[PDB]
Amino acid sequence: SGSWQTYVDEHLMCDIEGTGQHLASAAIFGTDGNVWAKSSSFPEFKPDEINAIIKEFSEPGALAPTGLFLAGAKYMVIQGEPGAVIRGKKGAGGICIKKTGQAMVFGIYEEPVNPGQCNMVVERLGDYLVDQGM
Amino acid sequence: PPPPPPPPP
Known about the structure:
By secondary structure, chain A is of the alpha+beta class.
């Protein structure tokens, strides 16, 4: 009801701006890579996939040549913001990951959702957490 | 994890 799981279910996985569309899945992780909550649909990620993401936030652009993997699926890395946002694309779907002071906020989308909407959902939550000192 | 802060609007 006020839990991390509620944050994911009600603030990441909500109907996007009344359009009738949703993210396919979402999660909130610590910057250390432990999951705080995820959606029932969030992919079966592996520990080294999460470490590579943590590395990409420390060494911007490391993944650009070879890709971002999550549950064995490859996303092509597109323009993000060093140490703060990682974006990726896979077909007409994608992924967006926003790092805060303490957390990383993941969003995964599939057509017809646009990358801008995923970015907007994940960044709105990420920015709120930063305001609460997280 | 830290405790969730109050959820936003």
